[PDB]
Structure formats: C-alpha cells, structure tokens
Amino acid sequence: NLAPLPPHVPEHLVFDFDMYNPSNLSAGVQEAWAVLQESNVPDLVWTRCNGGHWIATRGQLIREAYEDYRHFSSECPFIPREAGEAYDFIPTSMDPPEQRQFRALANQVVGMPVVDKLENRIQELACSLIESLRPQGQCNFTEDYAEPFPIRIFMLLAGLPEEDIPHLKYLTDQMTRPDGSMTFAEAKEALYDYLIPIIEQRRQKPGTDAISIVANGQVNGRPITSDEAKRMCGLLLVGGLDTVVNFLSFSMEFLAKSPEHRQELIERPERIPAACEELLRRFSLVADGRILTSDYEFHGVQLKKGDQILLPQMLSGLDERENAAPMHVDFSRQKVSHTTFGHGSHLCLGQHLARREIIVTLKEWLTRIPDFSIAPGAQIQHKSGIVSGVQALPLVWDPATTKAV
Ligand code: HEM
Ligand SMILES: [K+]
Numbered sequence: 001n002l003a004p005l006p007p008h009v010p011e012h013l014v015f016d017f018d019m020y021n022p023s024n025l026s027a028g029v030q031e032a033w034a035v036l037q038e039s040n041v042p043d044l045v046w047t048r049c050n051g052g053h054w055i056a057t058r059g060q061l062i063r064e065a066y067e068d069y070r071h072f073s074s075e076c077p078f079i080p081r082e083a084g085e086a087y088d089f090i091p092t093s094m095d096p097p098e099q100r101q102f103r104a105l106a107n108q109v110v111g112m113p114v115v116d117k118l119e120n121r122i123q124e125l126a127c128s129l130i131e132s133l134r135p136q137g138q139c140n141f142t143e144d145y146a147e148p149f150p151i152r153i154f155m156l157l158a159g160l161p162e163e164d165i166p167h168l169k170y171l172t173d174q175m176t177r178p179d180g181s182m183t184f185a186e187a188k189e190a191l192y193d194y195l196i197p198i199i200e201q202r203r204q205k206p207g208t209d210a211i212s213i214v215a216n217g218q219v220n221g222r223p224i225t226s227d228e229a230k231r232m233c234g235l236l237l238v239g240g241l242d243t244v245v246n247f248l249s250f251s252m253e254f255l256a257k258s259p260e261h262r263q264e265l266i267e268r269p270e271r272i273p274a275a276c277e278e279l280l281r282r283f284s285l286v287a288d289g290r291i292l293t294s295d296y297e298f299h300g301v302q303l304k305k306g307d308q309i310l311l312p313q314m315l316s317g318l319d320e321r322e323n324a325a326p327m328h329v330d331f332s333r334q335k336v337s338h339t340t341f342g343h344g345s346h347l348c349l350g351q352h353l354a355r356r357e358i359i360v361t362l363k364e365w366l367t368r369i370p371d372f373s374i375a376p377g378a379q380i381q382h383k384s385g386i387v388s389g390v391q392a393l394p395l396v397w398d399p400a401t402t403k404a405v
Contacts, residue, residue, distance in 0.1 A: 005048060053310055059337070072290035074095055077290060091106060105218075147245055159209025191237075203226065247280070251283060256395055278331055280341075368405075373395065
C-alpha cells in the first residue's frame with residue numbers, strides 16, 4: 001500500500017522501497033537494501049511505503065544528515081511515524097544540546113572502563129554457552145547462543161537477578177519483534193512497568209550497578225528524574241540485544257558458508273579484531289532516521305518540515321563510493337569505512353562492549369568448534385526493518401573435530 005505522493009516530492013525521485021519487506025529479501029537482506037545503490041537510483045529518494053518517507057542511499061548523505069541535528073531531528077527517529085512518535089527512550093529520542101549530558105551519563109555505565117571490568121564475565125559466558133553446545137554437533141546458533149548472550153551480559157551490568165531473564169526477554173521481544181497484537185506504545189509501557197519499581201528501589205537504596213548509577217545521576221545542572229532514568233534504562237536494556245544477536249548471526253552464517261574465511265581466522269587468530277571490523281561493515285544491520293525540523297534544501301532536493309528521512313546506517317559501508325568491491329568480504333581490507341554504529345552526536349555508546357562481545361565470541365567459537373556448516377538443505381531466512389536480522393541459523397559439526405575447553 002502506497003501513501004499519496006506529497007505535492008512537493010517530484011516523480012523522478014520516487015522509488016517504492018519497503019524497509020520491512022524489501023523485494024530481494026530471500027537473496028540476503030544487505031543485498032536487498034543495496035538495490036538502492038544501483039546506478040539509476042538517486043542519492044536521495046522518496047518511497048511511498050510505510051507512510052511515505054525519504055531515504056538517503058549513499059554514505060556521504062547519510063553521514064551529513066546524521067551530523068546536522070538542527071535540521072534532522074531524533075524526536076521521531078523511526079518509520080512508521082506512529083512508532084517514531086511514541087518512542088521516548090533517552091538519549092535516542094533527544095537532540096543536542098539537551099542530549100549531550102544524558103549521553104555522558106549513559107557513557108558511565110556502558111563505555112570503555114566498564115568494558116574491561118566485564119571482560120571476564122563475557123569470556124566466561126561465551127565459554128559456558130559454547131561448551132554446552134559443543135558435543136551436540138548441532139545448534140540453532142541464533143536461539144542457542146546469540147539470544148542468551150547479550151541479555152545475560154546486561155543483567156550483570158544492571159545488577160538484575162538471573163531469574164528475571166525469561167520475563168525480561170519476553171518483554172523486550174514483545175517490543176522489538178512485534179507481531180501486531182500490541183501497539184508500539186503498549187509494548188513500551190509493559191517494559192516500563194518492569195523498570196519503574198526497580199528505579200524506585202534503587203533511588204532509595206542505591207548500589208553500584210548501572211541502574212543505580214543512572215537513576216541517581218546528575219544531568220544538565222540537576223538530578224535526573226525517575227521518568228528520565230526509566231527512559232534511559234529502557235534504551236540501555238534494548239540497545240545491546242537485537243543488534244548483537246542479529247549481527248552475530250549474520251557473522252556466523254557467513255563463516256559457516258565460507259570455509260576459507262574460517263580457516264583464515266583459525267590459522268591467523270590475531271586477524272580476528274580486523275575481521276570483526278570488516279564483518280561490521282559487510283553485515284551492517286541498523287536503519288533508523290530523523291524528522292525534518294523545518295523546510296530545507298538538501299543536495300538539491302526540497303525537504304518539508306515534518307518529512308521523515310530514513311538514514312540507513314547499513315548503507316554507508318556497502319556504498320561502492322566508500323569501499324571498493326563492497327559485497328566482497330576481505331579481512332585484509334585497508335580502509336574499512338562504515339557507519340554500522342551510527343554517526344554524529346548519537347554514535348553508539350555500546351560500540352566497545354559490542355566489539356568485545358563479537359571478538360570474544362569469534363575467538364572462543366573458532367577454537368572450540370573450528371569446523372561447522374549450515375545444516376544441509378536449510379535455507380537461511382533474513383528479516384528486514386529497523387534492526388535487520390536472521391530468523392534461525394541451524395549449524396552442524398562433527399563433535400570429533402571439536403576441542404573440549
Ligand atoms: C552490533 C551491535 C550494535 C550496533 C550495530 C549498534 C548500533 C547503534 C546505532 C546505529 C546507534 C545510533 C542510533 C541513532 O543515531 O539514532 C546506536 C546508539 C546507541 N547504542 Fe548501540 N549498537 C550496538 C550495540 C550496543 C550495545 C551492546 C549497547 C549497550 C547498551 C548499545 C547502546 C547504545 C546506546 C545507549 C545508544 C544511544 C547513544 C545516544 O543516543 O547518544 N549499543 N547504536
Ligand atoms: K518521539
């Protein structure tokens with residue numbers, strides 16, 4: 001279903017891309033989005049799908065719009081508009097200058113120094129998960145490794161009890177994998193209902209966990225409100241889940257399908273940090289955006305106040321103008337350019353945690369289970385949206401080729 005073309009949008013810019021069900025999906029989600037980068041497609045296009053919105057298709061424009069928060073606001077950062085409007089997480093629904101100090105506070109609980117303290121739990125968790133699967137000679141990687149992993153790391157950061165995991169997973173899945181039974185707003189409130197009491201408790205009796213630190217923080221000259229803390233904690237919980245789960249799945253799918261790339265990292269483990277970066281570029285997966293604060297001419301195109309613009313983080317590193325031969329995976333690639341973690345004032349705060357999660361996973365998997373394949377006759381299904389992903393990833397291996405610890 002195609003929204004009526006707004007009068008200000010010229011015919012020549014119309015390309016009806018559907019970000020939730022793109023045409024070429026069965027052939028790979030990144031490939032399906034890359035159709036926007038074929039030579040007959042303008043740098044900035046309008047789709048009439050999903051309510052109607054702009055799409056910047058090239059890294060240059062994606063980066064530029066992410067820098068220009070004055071014109072391109074995060075107040076409504078998702079398509080469809082109804083989701084974007086309901087969304088009130090902090091700092092992702094806020095613009096500078098206000099956003100700056102909330103971002104500083106979030107950085108205390110997920111930034112660099114915290115990463116080093118977590119490293120042992122990250123490595124322990126990775127090992128225990130992998131050892132549980134290793135002698136079975138099969139798993140659904142997405143379900144059996146990827147899903148349990150980041151939620152467990154978050155519980156440790158946030159000092160939440162282990163027994164809360166299935167309920168919290170239920171709540172977060174309800175929000176980020178909607179089936180249409182709840183509005184976005186309803187799902188968000190259900191999540192908030194879990195967080196509200198905990199915030200109340202930790203403002204009275206704080207600990208040193210992430211929730212206590214956020215909930216008792218100072219921002220922009222005063223103490224954080226209970227409401228603001230709730231909106232921050234919502235993001236800190238969800239930000240690291242689907243992104244990491246789906247990114248690990250894209251990476252493991254590629255490695256199962258490429259024995260030569262596996263063998264490379266097996267023979268040359270020092271290359272894993274570089275491989276992580278090239279995989280972040282090739283299997284980039286996020287696509288959010290902004291709303292126009294005013295009428296604005298951007299690269300020769302008239303944009304109208306309140307227009308939504310999708311600025312897909314995924315596309316920058318797939319752009320052949322940024323990386324030559326963009327679909328080819330090359331662990332030796334020289335200037336790996338991407339915006340996988342975003343760009344501008346909202347550049348992912350979790351990027352350092354995410355890289356450790358990725359690198360630890362790859363290192364520990366390849367040393368215990370070096371040889372593995374997609375289950376024969378399985379066709380891997382991708383999903384597309386704000387966080388694109390893998391529906392299931394059935395892998396098999398001969399346990400005789402594996403290394404117990
Ligand atoms: C592969 C994994 C990840 C990817 C690809 C990713 C991607 C992104 C992107 C694209 C943004 C910017 C969104 C925008 O500009 O509207 C973002 C922001 C953010 N991410 Fe991540 N992320 C990942 C993992 C994580 C993790 C593990 C955490 C830890 C909680 C996290 C926490 C956040 C936070 C708090 C922000 C908001 C920063 C701000 O608004 O100032 N992310 N991320
Ligand atoms: K909003």
